[PDB]
């Protein structure tokens, strides 16, 4: 007569329990190697050998209870066998795992990915990019931030009238203007998580897409990259229905219904990005599926001035005006990425980038 | 009650442990044959019979502590069973393996390859090609060397402003000018390692590409050969999205996001090479993905003079000028490979190659 808690692979606290188990690896006869390396120079690579508990029946001594944990071997199922019928040590283990895991993810953003029909973490948590480090047009980031915050902070007004509690944004522009960087900065600012989804995968179908959109982690953003490339449209639409033009078991109607249909879930934010706004079917970007669409374009006077004052802090304000005037006179259209590269050429050299502005 | 260290196939020190195990092959009842052969002449091939320890349970007598090693058998795993609970002998074994392995790789370059979704070594370490042995245009190798060194030696400046710590270079030119040779010479000079990646493989997908680009070995270079051949573009781009045109499950957007997106890693250098600069999509070679693009072309006066003074050391300087003048007068465009071949015809024969210069 014991208690045999079973936690299979498909659990939200799976990573939390794994992290706690790596924390409590002491007094474990079976082990797995946990060595990492950090090269410095001269062929002297630092060694960091440690001990991940192997998928075995290691006996743990938490609170003096001789708790037995077994991880099997691609189907995985972790087991926490104990004595008697208490269930309190389970509460304590889950709480300690939560305290340890959330401590690790502090000041960072967690990136998930679509594995099969489920979300799994993708590498270590990444350092968040400061929002002010990305410079957009005047009064553009503020509008998006305010709209997202207003959507988050007003759930009651949605339910009191019956509108589904959903939202979606679309960003389009020339390549190299700040779409992905702004998305990353916004995710860092809002303390959310990014879920990467590809519409051209070979293991995606309508039912799997619906399940993925239904089981997305809470306090997270869903990102769709290059929606245009997954469906040729427009000129085709005038003759025949929208074909797939990709590798996968997906259809246009399935995606349209999954984004906003009858079975769509609630409290979800979706971001989509494209480079050709004119290649998207009108039914896909109608209100209800894409509430706000914004255009990010080439550089301007204020954007160039802000970028200059950001890359060379402490300089006089006249230098930024000189740089902006010279850049806008020498060339008409220019991308922020090219400006960033040109600045990267002249590292810590103000008044040097204000002379060699020949980048035609 | 023992300690059972488990090191599976997917480990960095796997090769180090294998090399140490081949070093400590003494006192091993089970063996595998280690014969190598070196032909000289007259059907007399020198034998080098030795003993690789077979994948068995050989008992080792390191430090007088009876250690029971075991390699199983696709799926491969190595086990180091010991006595008691000490963990010191594991540290000593790892340190000795590091000392032995790094001793072997001295003055050479290690070439990795993409097996499945992991990097594995490809043959014995190769002898490094001296940097000066590759002659490029005046002030071209120095610029690239300085830029790479500056990127390596300034990680703080990247972090203090938020730019991702990444870089990428592109080399393009006519076939037979020194792209791959210069890449090899630079890798030898910088004491890095080369990782070969093919975009046309049949076992490559977006997730696998991202995982490979994330787990690349430290102090290494990532090489992409003939990026143009993996994606037809330009004239197609004016009508329809970029097709893949190959054998494999890869997409243009997937490669674009993997090279520089949201989930891209840090501290990575990527080299790409092509022969048709006009067949590359503009979005692929924008700044942020290709920080520096350089053109290697046909021979010039200084290049020919340096090549002549390199292939025939000790000759008077007037002979180099005579050879350069005659070559540039008899022909307008010529590749360094053709000059190397023409010199190879006249081995150790200066003043002979300055007469038979008819290679129209
Ligand atoms: N507005 C901006 N402010 C600062 N840096 C920027 C800006 N736009 C782009 N960059 C920089 O340029 C590089 C590429 O930016 P990013 O990937 O966000 O461009 P993008 O518009 O998403 O391009 P693509 O459409 O090809 O994905 C990064 O180094 C990024 O930091
Ligand atoms: N600049 C050079 N100096 C010395 N040898 C050179 C030079 N360029 C080419 N060679 C020699 O020519 C041969 C081919 O060189 P390499 O493979 O680097 O050319 P490549 O430009 O990479 O050609 P491809 O585009 O076909 O790969 C080698 O023997 C190489 O040593
Ligand atoms: Mg992007
Ligand atoms: Mg080559």
UniProtKB/Swiss-Prot annotation, chains A, B:
Interacts with LETM1. It comes from the Eukaryota. Pfam families: AAA, AAA_lid_BCS1, BCS1_N. Chaperone necessary for the incorporation of Rieske iron-sulfur protein UQCRFS1 into the mitochondrial respiratory chain complex III. Plays an important role in the maintenance of mitochondrial tubular networks, respiratory chain assembly and formation of the LETM1 complex. Belongs to the AAA ATPase family. BCS1 subfamily. It comes from Mus musculus. ATP binds at residues 173-180. SUPFAM superfamilies: P-loop containing nucleoside triphosphate hydrolases. The gene is Bcs1l. It is found in: Mitochondrion inner membrane. One of its GO terms (cellular component) is mitochondrial inner membrane. The lineage of its organism: Eukaryota, Metazoa, Chordata, Craniata, Vertebrata. Its EC number is 3.6.1.-. This is Mitochondrial chaperone BCS1.
């Amino acid at each position: 007569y014991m208690i045999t808690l079973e936690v299979p692979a498909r659990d939200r606290s799976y990573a939390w329990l794994l992290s706690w188990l790596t924390r409590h690896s002491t007094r474990t006869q079976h082990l797995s190697v946990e060595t990492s390396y950090l090269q410095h120079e001269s062929g002297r690579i630092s060694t960091k050998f440690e001990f991940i508990p192997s998928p075995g029946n290691h006996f743990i001594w938490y609170q003096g209870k001789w708790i037995r944990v077994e991880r099997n071997r691609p189907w995985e199922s972790v087991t926490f066998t104990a004595l008697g019928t208490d269930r309190k040590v389970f509460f304590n283990i889950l709480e300690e795992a939560r305290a340890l895991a959330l401590q690790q993810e502090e000041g960072k953003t967690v990136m998930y990915t679509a594995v099969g029909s489920e979300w799994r973490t993708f590498g270590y948590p990444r350092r968040r990019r400061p929002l002010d480090s990305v410079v957009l047009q005047q009064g553009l980031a503020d509008r998006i931030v305010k709209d997202i915050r207003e959507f988050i902070d007003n759930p009651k007004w949605y339910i009191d009238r019956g509108i589904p509690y959903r939202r979606g944004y679309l960003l389009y522009g020339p390549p190299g203007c700040g779409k992905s960087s702004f998305i990353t900065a916004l995710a860092g600012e809002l303390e959310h998580s990014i879920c990467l989804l590809s519409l051209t995968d070979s293991s995606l179908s309508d039912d799997r897409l619906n399940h993925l959109l239904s089981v997305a982690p809470q306090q997270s953003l869903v990102l769709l990259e290059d929606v245009d490339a997954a469906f040729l449209s427009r000129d085709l639409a005038v003759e025949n229905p929208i074909k797939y033009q990709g590798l996968g078991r997906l259809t246009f109607s399935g995606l349209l219904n999954a984004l906003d249909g009858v079975a769509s879930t609630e409290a979800r934010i979706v971001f989509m990005t494209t480079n050709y706004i004119d290649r998207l079917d009108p039914a896909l970007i109608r209100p209800g599926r894409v509430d706000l669409k914004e255009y990010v374009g080439y550089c301007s006077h204020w954007q160039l001035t802000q970028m200059f004052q950001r890359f060379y802090p402490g300089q006089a304000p006249s230098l930024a005006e000189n740089f902006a005037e010279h850049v806008l006179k020498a060339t008409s259209e220019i991308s922020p990425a090219q400006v960033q590269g040109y600045f990267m050429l002249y590292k810590n050299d103000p008044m040097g980038a204000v002379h060699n502005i020949e980048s035609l």
